[PDB]
Design a protein around this ligand. Structure first.
Ligand code: FAD
Length: 421
């Protein structure tokens, strides 16, 4: 429509992709991008990878060049916080009291770092204690990635691991702490955690699992952290502390406007929230996965792209792409880590290749059904695995771990079985 105005709250990948996708699918109306961030929209993955390593330019981070917004006639309103939504009048209220009218509203609010309780007040304020989510966070941390200085990373998720890998390369003394018994405990099988723990320790990282931070010591003059204290009495001297204990989806605007919320903004098969004219997308969206027949909220680039493209399609009267298996990647010590599917609910894993080398695939199964596959330096088996998950192919479990049998042929057999019998 060339009259309907669309307002997108959030200028992260999700919001920006909706904006440009919209104008790419034939949208003629007005598009307004509104975000509290001041910087030009940029990619996030490089922030714990090449950019954090200081090897990529700031320019390379832009999602789209600044001129692109003008050319595609997309109004970008940065440094502006949306404080409320008025479904009745169909307007979004800005912190300055200003209100923007909308015919279609898209909430691409993403999430915010989960604060560490024992790092409140002065601790969190210290210039050498940071979470990693914004460009500002990344640059503040990078400036402090100094050889021989001591870093303590709190949190063992993929980003924590990527931060540790980057710091190690910068020759820092690195210690990583996780409360769980093994890193990535919730999304991987023990032998996979073992791989990562050994991988990092081998690189020089001192990983301490089952460790809980009880507090910090700080300098009076500089108001900087000088040490991290563990519940068991261990004192870890630190020149830098990076915390990453998860993300909190930004649903406040939704829950305040009476929209359904549950660890994310609930949306239906049409990307719509409880309110027809309001949609949600990206890290903040909790949707129903028909592939796994359950409600999930995914934090990944592929997820944002897929969801953003679906919204653009629907708002333009076009047909959305069929639901694809969820996937994401991680870069640690130049190792190609690619994960497809959701492992939740697996009752066994099958390793294809040796875990003593960064070259294998791990299949997560629930019975004979493949739920997900984590691949390490195996791009082809990764692509092939997407097909197995997305199409629910009946691949023979007893051959998945047999490297003398190409995955392509295992797949061929599964497909032939459907057509023949
Ligand atoms: C360091 C890092 C590394 C990552 N690496 C990978 C990776 O390797 N592979 C992968 O697949 N994914 C990775 N991710 C995750 C991926 O970047 C995100 O899932 C993806 O970019 C989608 O983000 P989003 O746009 O949904 O949310 P966000 O990027 O959080 O964007 C939401 C924006 O909206 C703003 N906003 C919220 N509320 C309001 C409001 N009321 N008014 C105005 N503005 C508001 C927020 O401040 C924010 O600026 C990484 C993320 C980080 C931080």
């Amino acid at each position: 429509n060339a009259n309907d105005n669309v307002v997108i709250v959030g200028t992260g990948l999700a919001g920006v992709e909706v904006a440009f996708g919209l104008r790419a699918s034939g949208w003629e109306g007005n598009i307004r991008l509104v975000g509290d961030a001041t910087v030009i929209p940029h990619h996030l993955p490089p922030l714990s990878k090449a950019y954090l390593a200081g090897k990529a330019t700031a320019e390379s981070l832009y999602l789209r060049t600044p001129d692109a917004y003008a050319a595609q006639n997309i109004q970008l309103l940065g440094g502006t916080q949306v404080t409320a939504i008025n479904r009745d009048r169909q307007q979004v209220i800005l912190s300055d009291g200003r209100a923007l009218d909308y015919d279609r509203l898209v909430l691409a609010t993403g999430g915010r770092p989960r604060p560490l309780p024992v790092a409140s007040g002065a601790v969190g304020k210290a210039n050498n204690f940071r979470y990693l989510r914004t460009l500002e966070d990344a640059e503040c941390i990078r400036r402090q990635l100094i050889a021989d200085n001591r870093l303590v990373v709190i949190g063992g998720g993929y980003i924590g691991l990527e931060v540790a890998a980057t710091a190690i390369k910068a020759n820092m003394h690195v210690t990583l702490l996780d409360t769980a018994a093994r890193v990535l405990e919730r999304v991987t099988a023990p032998p996979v955690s073992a791989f990562y723990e050994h991988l990092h320790r081998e690189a020089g990282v001192d990983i301490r699992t089952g460790t809980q931070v009880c507090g910090f010591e700080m300098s009076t003059d500089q108001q900087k952290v000088t040490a991290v204290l563990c519940e068991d009495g261990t004192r870890l001297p630190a020149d830098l502390v990076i915390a990453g204990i998860g993300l909190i989806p930004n649903c406040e605007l939704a829950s305040a406007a009476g929209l359904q919320v549950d660890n994310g903004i609930v949306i239906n098969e049409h990307m719509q929230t409880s309110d027809p004219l309001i949609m949600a997308v990206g890290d903040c969206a909790r949707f129903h996965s028909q592939l796994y027949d359950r409600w999930v909220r995914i934090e990944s680039v592929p997820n944002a792209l897929e969801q953003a493209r679906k919204i653009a399609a629907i708002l333009c009267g076009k047909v959305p792409r069929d639901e694809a298996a969820p996937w994401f990647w991680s870069d640690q010590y130049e190792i190609g880590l690619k994960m497809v599917g959701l492992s939740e609910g697996y009752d066994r894993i099958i390793v294809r290749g040796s875990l003593a080398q960064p070259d294998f695939s791990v299949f997560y199964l629930q019975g004979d059904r493949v739920l997900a596959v984590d691949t390490v330096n195996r791009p082809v088996e990764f692509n092939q695995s997407k097909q197995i998950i997305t199409d629910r192919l009946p691949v023979e479990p007893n051959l998945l771990g047999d490297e003398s049998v190409p995955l392509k042929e295992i797949i061929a057999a599964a497909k032939a079985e459907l057509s023949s019998a």
